[PDB]
Nucleic acid binder design. Structure first.
Lengths: 80, 82, 123, 205, 85, 129
RNA sequence: UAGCUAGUAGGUGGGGUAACGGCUCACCUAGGCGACGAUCCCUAGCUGGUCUGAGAGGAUGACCAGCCACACUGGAACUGAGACACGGUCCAGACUCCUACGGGAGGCAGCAGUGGGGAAUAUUGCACAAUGGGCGCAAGCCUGAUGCAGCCAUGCCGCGUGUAUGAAGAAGGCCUUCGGGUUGUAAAGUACUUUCAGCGGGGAGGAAGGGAGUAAAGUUAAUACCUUUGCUCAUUGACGUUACCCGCAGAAGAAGCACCGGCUAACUCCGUGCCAGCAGCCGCGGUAAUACGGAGGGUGCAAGCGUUAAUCGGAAUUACUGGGCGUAAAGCGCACGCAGGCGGUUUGUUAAGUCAGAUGUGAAAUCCCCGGGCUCAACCUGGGAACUGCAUCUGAUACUGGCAA
C-alpha cells in the first residue's frame, strides 16, 4: 500500500489548501520519557472539503508550491 | 565508466591491493561501489595470495564495467580454479 | 530534578574558564618585558620577588614571575612566558622560561637543571 | 632500554633473591641481603599500601627484565584475554623468549639468556630469532644454532640447570641442546610467592 | 594562461557565435507563432507553427536546445491554437 | 490524587512487612491480582484472596521467614511519570538473579526469568528483591 | 533577541527549467511562520570517527574516507554530457609588475620553495617500475595523483649501550655514637659474546604486462589482415651500495631526565638564616631546614625525561543511570487557572506507544573477537560480530494511549 499519516486540521483559510498538525509520540533520548511532538504540514486539497478542527489522512506527492508536498486522501472525523 | 580495479591499501614497501568496482573518475583509494576481492602480491607462499569473487565480477561486466590490466591478469590467473 | 523539568530545561554546568589568558591557549608566548620589578608577597611570607611586566605578542600586557637565583633581564630582553601561578604574589599568573630567547639559564646550578635552562656541566 | 647496573642492589631492595646472579656459586654469601639497599638501608621502611603494590610490580619486572611501557602493554594484553588477569600476565611473561631460554638452562641468568637471544644464537622452529620478547607458542622447538653451540657459557649454564627445579611445561633435553615449549605454564607451576593481584590493582587505579 | 586552454577559449568563442545565431533564429520563429496568437488568427498561427516545427526539432537534434524544451514549445503552442481554433 | 495504584500496592506491602503486619487489604484490580499471583508463585507472599462484589478487596497474607521479613525490598520501576519498556535482551535481573522483576509482557504478567525464557520483553513493573 | 513576513502564504492562467516548484510575471484571495522558540545576535564546515569514561555521557572532528563550500575580492555568463569552471572567458576593485605613457600583465587555499606572522611544523629530491587517471587501435606521451627517498625523538613499537665471575668488601667520595657504615659485585682483575652501528662479500620480492617470431581456432572469396589461445626469444625496478644472509676486528661507538615533608615510591650532611629562594594544594625559610642551594645516598621513568597548554576522568561538584531544598545553597507570600504533565474501575474493539520475527538499509576503514603475514611488536590483513538506528511487512495484546459502553 502507500505510506500515509493522520493528523488534524490546524487552520483552514487558504485557497484550495489546508495545514495539518501531526502528533508523533517520541521517547526523549536522554531522559526516557515519551513526549508528544508535532509536525505542521502544508497539505493540498482540491476543492477544499475539510474545514478546521477535522482529522484527515495525508500522503506525500510532488511539490505543489513552496513547502506543500502533501495531499489528502480521506477526511475522517469532522465533528464540531 | 565503472571499472573493476585495484586500490593500494597495505603499508609502505608492502602493498596489499583490494580489487573494487568504482566509478572510474573517483580517486584510487576513494569511493567504490563494491569491493569484490583482494590481491596480495606477497602474502607468503602459503595458500592463496588472491581471492576474487567471480560471480560479482561477471555481474558487473554484464552491466558494462571495464576491467584494468591487473584485474584481467588475475582473472587469467585464477581462471576457474587455477 | 523532576524529569519533566529537565525536558523543559536541561542541566547545564558552567564553563570553568582559564587561569591563563596566554591567548588561544598556546603553551608559551613571547613578550618584551616592559619593566622589571621586585615585589613583596602576601602576609605569611616575606621576600622580594623578582617579577617582570611584559607586553606579549598578542597584545596583552601581563606580569610574570622570574624563577631561580638571579637573572639578566632588563626592559627589552624578549622572553618566553609559560603559564603557572605564583600564589604568594597577588596577580602574577605566569612564569618566564629560563633558558629561552633572552633569558639565560640559572648560574651555577646542578639539580632540577632542565627547569632552569642550564646545560649539563662537562665532567 | 635495559637495566645495566648493580643487580644485587635490585635484589636487595626487594628483600628477596630475584635470581639476578644465578651463575657459579650457591646462595648469595656476598650480597649483605636484607641489610642495606642504600645508605639508610638499615632502617625499616614501614611501607604504605601504594608501596606494597608498587614494590610487587617492581619485583616482577626486575625478575623478568622488562621496563614499564612494555610491562604495561603486557597488562593490557593480559586484561583483554579471557580468564584471570594475574595468571594471564604471568603466562605472557613466561612465554618470552629470553625467559624460555633461561628456563631450559641455556643461560645462567635471564640477562645471559637475553644475550644469547640477542646475539643470534637461538632458533625457534628452525628460524633464528633475535628478539628478547618473542612470544613462544606451545609445541615449539627452540634450540641453539651451530655457531654458539659448544661455547662454554651454555655448557656451564646447563651445569647449573640441574641445581634448579626442572619446569614441568618444558622438554629440557641438553644432549642435543634443543627444547620444546609444550604448554602454557599453570599459575600453580611457577614461583608461588608473587602476588599478581597487587599488580592488577596497581594498574587498575 | 599558457596551455590548450587558449584553444578552448577560441573555440568556445566561435561556438558562442554560432549558437547565438541559431538560438536567435529559433526564438524569432517562436515569436512569429505566439505573436500570431496575439491576434485571433487561427490559420496564420498554424502556418507559423508549421514554419517553426522543423527548426525547433532540428535545433533539438543538433544539440543546443535539449529536446524536452523543444517538446514544451510545440506542446504549449498547440494548446494556444486549440484554445483559439 | 491516586495516580499509581500499583506503587500504592507495593507501598502497602513494604509498610506491612515493616510493621510486622499479618495481612494487607487494599482495593483490587486485574493488574494487582496479576502481580499478586506472580508474588505468590515466586514465594514472596503467603496467599491472596479477592473478596467483595461491587467493591473488590484484595488481601495479601504476607510472609515472615525468621523474625525477619521475606519481601526485603520491593520497588516500583515503571511509574506513570516515566514508563520503562525493556526488550528481551535489556531485561534485567535483580540481585544477580536472586530476586524477580515483574514484567508485563504481551503474553501476560510474568517474571524476568519466565519472560526471558518465553523470548519476549515488555514493561517492567517492579523489582522484588 | 517575542514578534517576523507583501513574491510574503495559497489559488488561476501565461512564461521558464532537463525536471516539480513563487522559479518568474499578471490577476485574485489574506494568508504563512512563532514560545515544540520564529526573527535577530554570537559561534561553527558536517559525518564515519578520535580522546576520555565501567557505563550513560562529556570533549572533539588533525591523518585516513564520504558529503558540502570556496579558488586574490565582488558579480556575471559562455562552451559543454557535466562548471556558473583552482592552473578558462568577461567586467569591476585592491595590490604587484612591464611600458615608447597610448596601453598592457598577473593570481601557490597544486608540489617544493620564499618573506611575514607565530611557542610551533619539512626538500626549490628521484621515478612514472607498481596502482590509478587522461588521450590513443596500439606503441606510447603526460601525470608534484601515486610510489619512494630527504629533514624532524612528533608519536607508537622493537632492539642496543654487553655477559658470567670477581672481597683486598681495594682506593677515592659521603656519613660516623670515629667501632665502623655506605657507595658496592659496583669498579679494577679474570673468562666469554658480537645484537645494532663500522668494514667487505652474497642477494630475494614488489614484474604483471608490453615487444618480436611461430602453431591452432574464429572470420573470410582468401592459407591475407585482424581477434583469441598456447609455445619460444630477448627484455621492463625510482627505491637501491634494498629487505635479508654470511664473513671481519674488538667491549670495543652508544644514558640521560625528574623526584626524595604529606598527598607520593625514595634520607642524611653541609651552606643560607622571613634572606636567597621553593610551591599543584597544605605550606617551608627569622641558626642545629628530611620542603631553599650543593653533596653523598636512594626512588621513578628511560632514548627519553620534565614543564607548560588543552580535553575527559576523579567530580554523585548539573546527579538520565546518579544529588538535593526545617537549620548548610535551595519551597514562589498565598491562591485561582489556561496551555502542559499525570489520571479510579469493568467490558468490548483498535494496535498508536510497547514487544517478537522477517526484509531493505545502517559505505569502506576504525573499535571488539577468532585467525594469517612482516624474526616479534607497532603495522598490514581474511572472516565474523558490531554499527545500540530508521523504514516497511507479518504477528502478540499484558500495560499505556484512541474509541464505544
Amino acid at each position: 500500500k502507500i505510506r500515509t499519516l493522520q493528523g488534524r486540521v490546524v487552520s483552514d483559510k487558504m485557497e484550495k489548501s489546508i495545514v495539518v498538525a501531526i502528533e508523533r509520540f517520541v521517547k526523549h533520548p536522554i531522559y526516557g520519557k515519551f513526549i508528544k511532538r508535532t509536525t505542521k504540514l502544508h497539505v493540498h486539497d482540491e476543492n477544499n472539503e475539510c474545514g478546521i478542527g477535522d482529522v484527515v489522512e495525508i500522503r506525500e506527492c510532488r511539490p505543489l508550491s513552496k513547502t506543500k508536498s502533501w495531499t489528502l486522501v480521506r477526511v475522517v472525523e469532522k465533528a464540531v | 565508466m565503472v571499472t573493476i580495479r585495484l586500490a593500494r591499501h597495505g603499508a609502505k614497501k608492502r602493498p596489499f591491493y583490494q580489487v573494487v568496482v568504482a566509478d572510474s573518475r573517483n580517486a584510487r583509494n576513494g569511493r567504490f561501489i563494491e569491493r569484490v576481492g583482494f590481491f596480495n602480491p606477497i602474502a607468503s607462499e602459503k595458500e592463496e595470495g588472491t581471492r576474487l569473487d567471480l560471480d560479482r565480477i561477471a555481474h558487473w561486466v554484464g552491466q558494462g564495467a571495464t576491467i584494468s590490466d591487473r584485474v584481467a591478469a588475475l582473472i587469467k590467473e585464477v581462471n576457474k580454479a587455477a | 530534578a523532576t524529569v519533566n523539568q529537565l525536558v523543559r530545561k536541561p542541566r547545564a554546568r558552567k564553563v570553568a574558564k582559564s587561569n591563563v589568558p596566554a591567548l588561544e591557549a598556546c603553551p608559551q608566548k613571547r613578550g618584551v618585558c616592559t619593566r622589571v620589578y621586585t615585589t613583596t608577597p602576601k602576609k605569611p611570607n616575606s621576600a622580594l620577588r623578582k617579577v617582570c611586566r611584559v607586553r606579549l605578542t598578542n597584545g596583552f600586557e601581563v606580569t610574570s614571575y622570574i624563577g631561580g637565583e638571579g637573572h639578566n633581564l632588563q626592559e627589552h630582553s624578549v622572553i618566553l612566558i609559560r603559564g603557572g601561578r605564583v600564589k604568594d604574589l597577588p596577580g602574577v599568573r605566569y612564569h618566564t622560561v629560563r633558558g629561552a630567547l633572552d633569558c639565560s639559564g640559572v648560574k651555577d646550578r646542578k639539580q632540577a637543571r632542565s627547569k632552569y635552562g642550564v646545560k649539563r656541566p662537562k665532567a | 632500554a635495559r637495566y645495566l647496573g648493580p643487580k644485587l642492589k635490585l635484589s636487595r631492595r626487594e628483600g628477596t633473591d630475584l635470581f639476578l646472579k644465578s651463575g657459579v656459586r650457591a646462595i648469595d654469601t656476598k650480597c649483605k641481603i636484607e641489610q642495606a639497599p642504600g645508605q639508610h638501608g638499615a632502617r625499616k621502611p614501614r611501607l604504605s599500601d601504594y608501596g606494597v603494590q608498587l614494590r610487587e610490580k617492581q619485583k616482577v619486572r626486575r625478575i623478568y627484565g622488562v621496563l614499564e611501557r612494555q610491562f604495561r602493554n603486557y597488562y593490557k594484553e593480559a586484561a583483554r584475554l579471557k580468564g584471570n588477569t594475574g595468571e594471564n600476565l604471568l603466562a605472557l611473561l613466561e612465554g618470552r623468549l629470553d625467559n624460555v631460554v633461561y628456563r631450559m638452562g641455556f643461560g645462567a641468568t635471564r640477562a645471559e639468556a637475553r644475550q644469547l637471544v640477542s646475539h643470534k644464537a637461538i632458533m625457534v622452529n628452525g628460524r633464528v630469532v633475535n628478539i628478547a620478547s618473542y612470544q613462544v607458542s606451545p609445541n615449539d622447538v627452540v634450540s641453539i644454532r651451530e655457531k654458539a653451540k659448544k661455547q662454554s657459557r651454555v655448557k656451564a649454564a646447563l651445569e647449573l640447570a640441574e641445581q634448579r627445579e626442572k619446569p614441568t611445561w618444558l622438554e629440557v633435553d641438553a644432549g642435543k641442546m634443543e627444547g620444546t615449549f609444550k604448554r602454557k605454564p599453570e599459575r600453580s607451576d611457577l614461583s608461588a610467592d608473587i602476588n599478581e593481584h597487587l599488580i592488577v590493582e596497581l594498574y587498575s587505579k | 594562461n599558457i596551455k590548450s586552454a587558449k584553444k578552448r577559449a577560441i573555440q568556445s568563442e566561435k561556438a558562442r557565435k554560432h549558437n547565438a545565431s541559431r538560438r536567435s533564429m529559433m526564438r524569432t520563429f517562436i515569436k512569429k507563432v505566439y505573436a500570431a496568437i496575439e491576434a485571433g488568427d487561427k490559420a496564420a498561427a498554424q502556418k507559423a507553427f508549421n514554419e517553426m516545427q522543423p527548426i525547433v526539432d532540428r535545433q533539438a537534434a543538433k544539440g543546443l536546445i535539449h529536446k524536452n524544451k523543444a517538446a514544451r514549445h510545440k506542446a504549449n503552442l498547440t494548446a494556444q491554437i486549440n484554445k483559439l481554433a | 490524587s491516586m495516580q499509581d495504584p500499583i506503587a500504592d500496592m507495593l507501598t502497602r506491602i513494604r509498610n506491612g512487612q515493616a510493621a510486622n503486619k499479618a495481612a494487607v487489604t487494599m482495593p483490587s484490580s486485574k493488574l494487582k491480582v496479576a502481580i499478586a499471583n506472580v508474588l505468590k508463585e515466586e514465594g514472596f507472599i503467603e496467599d491472596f484472596k479477592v473478596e467483595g462484589d461491587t467493591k473488590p478487596e484484595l488481601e495479601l497474607t504476607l510472609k515472615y521467614f525468621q523474625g525477619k521479613a521475606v519481601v526485603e525490598s520491593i520497588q516500583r520501576v515503571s511509574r506513570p511519570g516515566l514508563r520503562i519498556y525493556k526488550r528481551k535482551d535489556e531485561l534485567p535481573k535483580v540481585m544477580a538473579g536472586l530476586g524477580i522483576a515483574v514484567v508485563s509482557t504481551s503474553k501476560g504478567v510474568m517474571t524476568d526469568r519466565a519472560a526471558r525464557q518465553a523470548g519476549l520483553g515488555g514493561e517492567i513493573i517492579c523489582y522484588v528483591a
